[PDB]
Amino acid sequence: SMNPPPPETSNPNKPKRQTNQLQYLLRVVLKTLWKHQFAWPFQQPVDAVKLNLPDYYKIIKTPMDMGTIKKRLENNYYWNAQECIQDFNTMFTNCYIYNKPGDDIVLMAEALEKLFLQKINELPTEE
Amino acid sequence: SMNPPPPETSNPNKPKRQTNQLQYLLRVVLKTLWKHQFAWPFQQPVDAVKLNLPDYYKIIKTPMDMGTIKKRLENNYYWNAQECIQDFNTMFTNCYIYNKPGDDIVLMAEALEKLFLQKINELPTEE
Incomplete structure (x- = not known):
């Protein structure tokens, strides 16, 4: 009956690189998804203690949220x-x-997924 | 302080009618919003004593909730x-x-209002 720690967002041993694709994902993809009207329930880890949802992290064993994604991109975790x-x-x-x-x-989430897919259609070439 | 009585839901001294729009408001509008994942804080009168909100009914002098709206529609209050x-x-x-x-x-609330407005957009035509 306690939230798990949020996903790790820093991996200082991993090599780091900037690519056009990674920069696009942060500067365009994450930005567009963040400001969508449907984004707020996905912007931070589900706070199952605050919401009184004891079953959430019994069911969801690989949590992920847009705040964690933003931090990973910022820390060149990918x-x-x-x-x-x-x-x-x-x-x-x-x-x-x-x-x-x-x-x-x-x-x-379906509508956010359609937008995400619309955006990654424009992903810069891997080159 | 203490909670007020909930809003009235019955008015025996008011004429009654069934219309296309009132039926829709109960069977489509109220039903849809009730079953929304964000609905639980709005389904009943704010129990301001149970929530430790002693100021609620000093601020809110016209309280309203979906359980009251459901009863009013069922009792032909409107x-x-x-x-x-x-x-x-x-x-x-x-x-x-x-x-x-x-x-x-x-x-x-804002997400429920947006869904509410979409469902109202499809209210059947007035008789």
């Missing part, structure tokens, strides 16, 4: 842009896992 | 749909009044 896209995908599917098809929170 | 729509608006603006921009409860 070497490959797909590791970041995976975290985004984990955040959406965590919503589909915890809730039920057609739920309103799920319709919210 | 002759026009705008009476019911006004109770919804009161419930949302009460939340904005008592709390502050950016609070969790306010963001929940």
Whole structure:
């Protein structure tokens, strides 16, 4: 009956690089998703103690949120842009896992997923 | 202090009518919002003594909640749909009044209002 620690966002032993793709994910993708009207329930880890949701972290064993993604990009925690896209995908599917098809929170995450996909269509070439 | 009696939900001395719009407000509007994941703080009158909110009914002098709106629709309390729509608006603006921009409860209210407005956009045509 206690929230887990948030996901790690710093990995100081890992090599670091800046790519056009990683910079785009932070400066465009994360930015556009953050300001969407549906974003706030996904911006921080679910606070299951505050919400009185004792089952959340019994069901969700790989939590992910947009605040954690932002910090990872800022700390060059990702070497490959797909590791970041995976975290985004984990955040959406965590919503589909915890809730039920057609739920309103799920319709919210679905709309955010469509926008995320629209944005990564414009991802700069890996070059 | 103490809680007030909840809003009245019955008016025997008022004429009654069933209309396309009132039926929609109960079976579609109220139903949809009730089943929203963000609905639980608005389904019943604020128990300001149980929530440790002694100032709530000093600030909020026209309280309104979805359980009251549900009963009013079931008891034909409303002759026009705008009476019911006004109770919804009161419930949302009460939340904005008592709390502050950016609070969790306010963001929940705003999401319900946006869904409410979409469902009202599809109110059947007036007889």
